[PDB]
Amino acid sequence: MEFFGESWKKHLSGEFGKPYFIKLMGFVAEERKHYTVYPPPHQVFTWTQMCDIKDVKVVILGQDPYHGPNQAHGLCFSVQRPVPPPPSLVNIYKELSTDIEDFVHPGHGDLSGWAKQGVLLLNAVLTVRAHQANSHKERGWEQFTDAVVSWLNQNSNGLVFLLWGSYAQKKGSAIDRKRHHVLQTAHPSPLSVYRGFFGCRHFSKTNELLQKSGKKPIDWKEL
């Protein structure tokens, strides 16, 4: 695999040879031949390119990538300029405006600044056919992302997992609550944000936790 961070490849390359992954790449390769597939190949693994796997401190689980032109680019809840922050991200910024005193809305929805600090913005499914949500589900990506989640679960220490919504809470249901910190709440989406996300204060909490264990906190305003 290309466009895949070396530090991550060194620990996860074992997945590339497994049958489920091999079949997966073939399905994706076949899809790209007939339709437009997001994100483009060089951005499918952006989450492995923003920081060394050893610097991962926070994990935010997402589901499917955005299926609109130039929206998805490898990180969950993130969109490239000049795409405006989607409803869910505006609510994320809203919570931050009350939870983190120095946070400022940057106007854009590009979360690369967080990924650079060790915030793994991982979607469960990494590709999607243009304008067809969930089109690439149950093709092999989930087995891969679960493999990634599992590696981090068994090999890291003191990570903070942010599980927002039903899909993420289910996928993160196996995280060791003793070895790691798991914060859960409603999905930031307008349809469920009022059920608990507003007021969850997960960003301030994440930093209090990271800092307590002697780790570098996330400067959320650094986007």
UniProtKB/Swiss-Prot annotation:
Chain sites annotated for binding dsDNA: 67, 88, 166, 187, 189, 192, 195
Catalysed transformations (reactions): Hydrolyzes single-stranded DNA or mismatched double-stranded DNA and polynucleotides, releasing free uracil; a 2'-deoxyuridine in single-stranded DNA + H2O = a 2'-deoxyribose 5'-monophosphate in single-stranded DNA + uracil; a 2'-deoxyuridine in double-stranded DNA + H2O = a 2'-deoxyribose 5'-monophosphate in double-stranded DNA + uracil
Entry superkingdom: Eukaryota
EC number: 3.2.2.27
Residues bearing the modification N6-acetyllysine: 205
Similarity annotation: Belongs to the uracil-DNA glycosylase (UDG) superfamily. UNG family.
Entry protein name: Uracil-DNA glycosylase
Organism: Homo sapiens
Shown part of the complete sequence: 91 to 313 of 313
